[PDB]
Design a protein around this ligand. Structure first.
Ligand SMILES: NC(=O)C1=CN([C@@H]2O[C@H](COP(=O)(O)OP(=O)(O)OC[C@H]3O[C@@H](n4cnc5c(N)ncnc54)[C@H](OP(=O)(O)O)[C@@H]3O)[C@@H](O)[C@H]2O)C=CC1
Ligand SMILES: NC(=O)C1=CN([C@@H]2O[C@H](COP(=O)(O)OP(=O)(O)OC[C@H]3O[C@@H](n4cnc5c(N)ncnc54)[C@H](OP(=O)(O)O)[C@@H]3O)[C@@H](O)[C@H]2O)C=CC1
Ligand SMILES: COc1cc([C@@H]2OC[C@@H]3[C@H]2CO[C@H]3c2ccc(O)c(OC)c2)ccc1O
Ligand SMILES: COc1cc([C@@H]2OC[C@@H]3[C@H]2CO[C@H]3c2ccc(O)c(OC)c2)ccc1O
Lengths: 309, 309
């Protein structure tokens, strides 16, 4: 019944948002941009979205009128535009979609590509990693400057990037024998299975309680320190890892000499694991996903980590 | 009971071979290399394989003994090494895998990364695209010099790359109004759904009738000229396309000025659509997959194209 267009449909979180939308019963449309020519994996993703009942909608960010038509077909727009330097970081491209929405005037709600650290709260962050927050704030201000009703989904680390690897930067698998603990390891971090983030997204986009609101993904059982997450892994394996504590001064040493994308990752990690930006402020139950949607039975970090045994 | 090691598990056809091996009931092992630590999509394929019952085996082509130890665990090795210029063309890396298979001595059969044009018949092929057939023949010669038992799966155009686009290059979708036709369009081409290719592969690797044989994938109902292919789409859509014929001399014009991966593609199309190298020779029923495995209800091109509607 609610019509939803997903932009960034074949992206990491986007393809999950698409599926979650179909599973929730939204009439679901996905923007197929024509610039994806020989990218066979994207094409076949679109093919499989259609098999499950998504509706292809052709459009391009180089064709302002195509964006206008596209968003004219739906009540809700969800953007999953890319925003990670080691992949690509085109948050600002959404500006064109905001103004398409402005001109079209039918969109009851817009969800921009947030799904992470809360932008309004990273004003102190260090470049280059800060470009993320600023660009999202740039889009937030364009949304509000056009009066577009909105929901911002913030709050949780993607489990695949921060849990499955015990928060080590070199990899996405657990370490064999040795692990680095950032600082004392006693700073709470919020972890969420990406399928849960998508599930909450699909449940909130037409929840009246989240209209013009920031929704936090902070499921209580998944608020864990890094030493706590490493300890779940040690339990699951019955083996203790050699832990080296890394001080902030050492984690940042010679950052100036590193490639810009890695500097940005280091900056993001710094804010999460040394400053604790995801848990350094409180949020009530009228703005937290697992409390707004208690039937969602979110995966806990131990079952997430069990897949890696 | 047949234990297969798939090298190239996450590749385009490789991941399809992984799942076909599982569905066929082979005890299925997949080589997970440590170099792919930060490619999220590959890491999560390995997880998805695991959940299906595949067995993870760690090994690197930069660690000869890891390869030896890898191939020691299985009866059959299937290689799906990359070999397309606009993706990756590393056929010759298999030579190290061949060395390992030689040293290990237990392997009952090897399937090298073939799955296309039949290399020994591409003697007179145009550079740079000729690179593909020369590297596969250099690999073939190491397999036989080393007395390794083999099966070569050849003969079919991947349907995604030649059928879902009506054989239009540099796109993967059917054109909306106009189609180019190479020559008169009456040269017979062989098309196969890549899942049928993987299923035949999984079925042939423990088939006594195909030990040390070339196996052609030439499903008779999918032996089509390009015009017949185009006419199937026209009947699905109910819309006639405006057809422009393109002579060999204009298709090949100024080839030397092309990005050399496009030179490789041009040459490959030329051999397929202009010289009919996939249909210029007959093959017996004792060496053709649909005839060896009639229980496989292979997808025809009308059922294939219904996905693009
Ligand atoms: N731990 C956390 O909390 C994390 C948060 N995030 C955030 O998730 C959001 C999405 O991240 P992620 O899923 O990796 O993004 P992706 O790299 O996966 O890209 C998503 C989509 O962006 C579209 N895209 C990329 N470039 C362009 C372009 N020039 N023009 C139009 N469309 C483009 C593409 O859409 P199309 O499908 O049309 O091709 C692509 O599929 C980001 O804000 C990111 O910061 C992501 C990582 C972790
Ligand atoms: N119409 C036709 O007949 C077609 C035929 N083909 C043929 O199919 C075969 C597979 O092609 P395709 O599926 O596109 O292959 P891909 O390009 O998708 O790559 C397959 C695998 O090759 C592995 N790989 C790549 N580089 C290396 C490397 N340096 N060292 C070790 N492993 C590497 C990777 O394995 P890993 O997953 O472990 O990381 C990769 O996943 C090729 O011979 C191709 O020539 C391909 C296109 C069309
Ligand atoms: C938790 O908030 C965010 C998370 C990220 C995800 O941390 C920045 C990124 C990212 C995932 O890719 C993370 C990252 C960057 C560099 C790395 O080496 C890395 O290794 C796992 C992981 C992106 C933006 C955010 O606001
Ligand atoms: C059919 O046998 C083969 C086909 C190929 C096909 O053509 C080169 C590739 C593989 C897939 O990609 C085809 C391709 C090349 C260039 C293009 O522009 C293209 O557009 C669809 C498609 C490669 C090796 C083969 O043995």
């Amino acid at each position: 019944k609610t019509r939803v267009l997903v932009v960034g449909a074949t992206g990491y979180i986007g393809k999950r948002i698409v599926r979650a939308c179909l599973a929730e019963g939204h009439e679901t449309y996905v923007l197929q941009r024509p610039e994806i020519g020989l990218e066979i994996e994207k094409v076949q993703l679109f093919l499989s979205f259609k098999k499950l009942g998504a509706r292809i909608v052709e459009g391009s960010f180089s064709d302002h009128q195509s964006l206008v038509s596209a968003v004219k077909l739906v009540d809700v727009v969800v953007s999953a535009m890319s925003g990670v330097h080691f992949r690509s970081h085109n948050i600002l491209v959404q500006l064109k979609l905001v103004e398409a929405i402005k001109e079209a005037g039918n969109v009851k709600r817009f969800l921009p590509s947030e799904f992470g650290m809360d932008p309004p709260r990273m004003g102190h962050a260090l470049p280059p990693g800060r470009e993320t927050f600023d660009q999202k704030m740039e889009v937030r201000q364009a949304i509000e400057a056009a009066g577009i009703p909105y929901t911002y989904v913030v709050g949780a680390c993607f489990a695949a990037y921060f849990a499955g690897n015990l928060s080590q930067m070199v990899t996405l698998l657990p370490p064999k024998e040795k692990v680095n603990i950032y600082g004392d390891g006693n700073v709470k971090v919020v972890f969420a299975d990406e399928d849960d983030i998508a599930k909450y997204t699909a449940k909130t986009l037409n929840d009246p309680r989240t209209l013009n609101k920031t929704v936090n993904i902070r499921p209580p059982d998944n608020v864990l320190t890094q030493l706590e997450l490493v300890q779940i892994w040690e339990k699951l394996t019955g083996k203790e890892l050699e832990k080296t504590n890394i001080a902030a001064q050492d984690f940042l040493a010679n950052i100036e000499q590193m490639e810009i994308p890695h500097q940005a990752g280091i900056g993001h990690f710094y804010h999460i694991f040394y400053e604790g930006c995801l848990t350094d402020h409180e949020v009530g139950e009228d703005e937290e996903a697992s409390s707004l949607y208690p039937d969602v039975k979110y995966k806990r970090m131990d079952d997430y980590l069990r897949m890696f045994l």
